[PDB]
């Protein structure tokens, strides 16, 4: 930690220092063949917070990234997927929502339907026999490990069933059981409709009582197993497919415009810096 | 003693007839291009010639 060490130190990229962007994977994610010229490569960026799931479709330009369509998991409560906003169905629904929004934006909404009634089947979006090819998006997972059921593939599966063409394999689906290399459709459908939460409910109904009360809070006050989980997930799938449009609310700047700049630590000027230096010298009294 | 390489007169010899530039041609051979690009351009040019000839004949 010497002065020459600091002088010769070369910092990484800002996002690499922040630990947000894998530039090695990003280069291969956005790199169009030069003979295709200005054809943009679209990435289905999927990110998970502790509570929320964000899925969006991004195209990269020279000056920065451009978002075509977006869908955050803090929108599904308007459809009926309140509570557990980071579950498998939450990722599936927001992937389906962003797929419908992108298809509407590109015009392939009422023509390229995906799987209106999911059944846990590995189905790639086939192209029309005589018509435009399906919208092709490549999944982006960021830094999350690609384990068998990491929920990046769950969001990808939802986006693919929404009508988008996401090239993928069933290797990393919830139930795959890699001995005979066969997908488990029952497990896939169970995870799509939140059956893993239901099995957790069955195991915890009478095994620790207090743990089932303290964990899975919130929804304990409104819902119960087998009453709405598979049902309301299917109904909101239909609701999303019926009306996937996004709207801007009326919460404008208004009073928040003036109720925000007050709590900002402002920077002093050179004159104030000189005054503070002189005041500190006087306070020391050694000059 | 052999191995008497030098470059004293080589520049003068080159500039005696000058540094000639190659002749510039309007069209370059497509053997230097991509195989798929050339194959598609063959059909594209064929259709363009057919369309132009049809326009001249009909009009």
């Amino acid at each position: 930690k010497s002065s020459p060490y600091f002088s010769r130190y070369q910092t990484k990229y800002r996002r690499r220092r922040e630990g947000k962007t894998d530039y090695y994977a990003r280069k291969r994610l956005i790199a169009q063949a030069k003979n295709k010229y200005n054809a943009p490569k679209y990435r289905l960026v999927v990110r998970f917070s502790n509570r929320f799931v964000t899925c969006q479709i991004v195209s990269s330009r020279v000056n920065g990234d451009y978002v075509l369509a977006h869908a955050h998991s803090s929108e599904l409560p308007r459809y009926g997927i309140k509570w557990g906003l980071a579950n498998w169905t939450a990722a599936y629904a927001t992937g389906l929502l962003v797929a419908r929004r992108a298809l509407a934006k590109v015009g392939l909404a009422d023509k390229y339907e995906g799987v209106t009634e999911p059944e846990g089947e590995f189905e790639l979006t086939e192209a029309i026999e005589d018509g435009p090819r399906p919208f092709k998006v490549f999944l982006d997972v960021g830094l999350k490990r690609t384990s068998t059921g990491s929920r990046v593939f769950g969001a990808m599966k939802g986006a693919s069933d929404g009508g988008l063409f996401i090239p993928h394999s069933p290797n990393r689906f919830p139930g795959f059981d890699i001995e005979t290399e066969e997908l488990d459709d029952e497990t896939l459908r169970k995870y799509i409709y939140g059956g893993h939460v239901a099995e957790y409910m069955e195991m915890l109904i009478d095994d620790d009582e207090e743990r089932y009360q303290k964990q899975f809070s919130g929804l304990i006050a409104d819902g119960i197993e087998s009453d709405q989980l598979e049902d309301i997930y299917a109904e909101a799938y239909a609701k999303i497919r019926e009306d996937p449009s996004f709207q801007k609310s009326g919460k404008d700047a208004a009073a928040f415009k003036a109720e925000s700049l007050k709590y900002t630590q402002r920077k002093l000027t050179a004159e104030e810096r000189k005054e503070r230096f002189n005041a500190k010298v006087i306070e020391a009294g050694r000059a | 003693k052999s191995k008497n390489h030098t470059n004293h007169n080589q520049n003068k010899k080159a500039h005696r007839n000058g540094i000639k530039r190659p002749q510039k041609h309007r069209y370059d051979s497509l053997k230097y291009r991509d195989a798929k690009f050339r194959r598609n351009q063959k059909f594209a040019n064929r259709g363009t010639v057919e369309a132009i000839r049809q326009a001249k004949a009909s009009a």
């Binding site: 230096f277 002189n278 500190k280 010298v281 006087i282 020391a284 050694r286 000059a287 | -």
Partner: protein
């Protein structure tokens, strides 16, 4: 005229240098002491040998030890042999120092009452070096880069504090608390 040929991993077997001691006399003097400096500068490009450097150093030291005492001079050799001269056997042979324009060879800091003998020591040792040389009465205060009048003016305020042979000076950077704790006599005027 050859490119510099120092000792390195490509030129390893080189005969040892001849000058080992480069400072003679009261090396641990003070900035306040020795208010006069004499330098032996070179007015032309030379290739001074280590043999000449050590011979002149010995001659200067033996002359200085009996005119003012061993504790009155800080003779320093400012030329170091770094070029290896090769010779075909009758392939390093010797070590020489390359000297540019206005480069100092020997430096002596003494008092104002010893200026005459400080000049005389370098004048006598001029005969041991090839080429021509000059003797300059340095306008700076000893080995300090500052001038005499500037140094005493700053010392009156208290911006200079001695430390062994050299001293430390006030600079317009660093922590204010550390600067205050290290320079008590320095009057930090608010300006």
């Amino acid at each position: 005229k050859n490119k510099p040929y120092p000792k390195s991993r490509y030129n390893r077997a080189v005969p040892d240098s001849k000058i080992r001691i480069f400072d003679l006399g009261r090396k641990r003097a003070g900035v306040d002491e020795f208010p006069l400096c004499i330098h032996l500068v070179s007015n032309e490009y030379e290739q001074i040998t280590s043999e000449a450097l050590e011979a002149a150093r010995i001659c200067a030291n033996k002359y200085l030890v009996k005119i003012g005492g061993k504790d009155s001079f800080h003779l320093r050799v400012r030329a170091h042999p770094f070029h290896v001269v090769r010779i075909n056997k009758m392939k390093p042979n010797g070590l020489v120092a390359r000297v540019n324009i206005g480069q100092i060879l020997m430096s002596v800091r003494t008092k104002d009452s010893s200026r005459a003998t400080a000049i005389e020591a370098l004048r006598r040792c001029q005969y041991k070096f090839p080429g021509q040389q000059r003797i300059i009465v340095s306008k700076k205060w000893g080995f300090s880069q500052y001038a005499r009048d500037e140094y005493i003016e700053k010392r009156s305020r208290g911006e200079i504090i001695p430390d062994g042979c050299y001293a430390k000076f006030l600079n317009k950077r660093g922590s204010l608390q550390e600067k205050l704790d290290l320079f008590p006599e320095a009057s930090f005027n608010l300006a």
